[PDB]
Design a binder for this molecule. Structure first.
Ligand SMILES: N[C@]12C[C@H]3C[C@H](C[C@H](C3)C1)C2
Ligand SMILES: N[C@]12C[C@H]3C[C@H](C[C@H](C3)C1)C2
Lengths: 153, 62
């Protein structure tokens, strides 16, 4: 149910990157991220909402207004920071990875394009460090995330 | 097995993001998520060809 929904979310995201514009794919990738966040914590209603919003973007691919893309970016931020609360029974590694992902979303909300690039590169790096179990680099990657979410605040 | 190819293509996308242009970065992320899809659905041929295409876009940004 949750594993078949995130995959449809990914499919919709790919179609959006086929069709959408920089702001629309920005929104869609932020969606995929907070979706994975919710999957890590067991909140399925969130991921259902995420599939609904991504399909909404796909449908209104030529009628959506950047004002409401920004509303959804801010909302996705707020939601990710709220979902982080259910992540207190998992290893420290995945917790720091989840916080890194949420900070990346909050950067995608208000940050400029180059800052979003940097945040996505650091998110990828954290995804590698998780497979390597490297604490000493993901801690500093989260700290550098923080030296960014407010750097564009 | 599959996670090794995942690591290779993820490294490739991470380094494509450091100098390439927006189209190269978007295509790299496209290949990344297509990989993720195939790796979740278990299909070695797919992940392998996605790795080939990722190294190909890296060769595009010589
Ligand atoms: N303009 C951008 C489109 C897309 C999202 C973000 C990072 C990359 C890929 C360049 C902004
Ligand atoms: N896992 C990710 C796929 C895609 C590229 C990068 C940033 C976002 C969008 C999440 C890693």
């Amino acid at each position: 149910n949750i594993k078949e929904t995130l995959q449809k979310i990914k499919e919709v995201v790919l179609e959006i990157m086929d069709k959408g514009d920089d702001e629309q794919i920005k929104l869609a990738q932020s969606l995929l991220i907070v979706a994975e966040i919710a999957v890590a914590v067991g909140d399925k209603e969130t991921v259902e909402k995420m599939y609904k919003e991504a399909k909404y973007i796909l449908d209104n691919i030529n009628s959506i207004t950047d004002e409401e893309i920004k509303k959804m970016l801010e909302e996705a931020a707020k939601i990710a920071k709220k979902l982080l609360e259910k992540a207190k029974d998992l290893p420290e590694e995945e917790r720091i990875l989840l916080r890194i992902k949420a900070l990346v979303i909050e950067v995608m909300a208000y940050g400029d394009d180059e800052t979003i690039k940097e945040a996505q590169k650091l998110l990828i790096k954290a995804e590698l460090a998780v497979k390597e179990g490297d604490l000493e680099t993901l801690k500093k990657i989260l700290k550098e995330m923080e030296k960014m979410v407010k750097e564009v605040k | 097995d599959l996670e090794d190819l995942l690591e290779k293509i993820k490294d490739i996308v991470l380094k494509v993001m450091d100098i390439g242009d927006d189209e190269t970065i978007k295509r790299a992320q496209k290949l990344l998520i297509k990989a993720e899809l195939a790796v979740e659905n278990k299909d070695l041929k797919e992940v392998e060809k996605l790795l080939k295409e990722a190294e190909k876009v890296y060769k595009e940004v010589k």
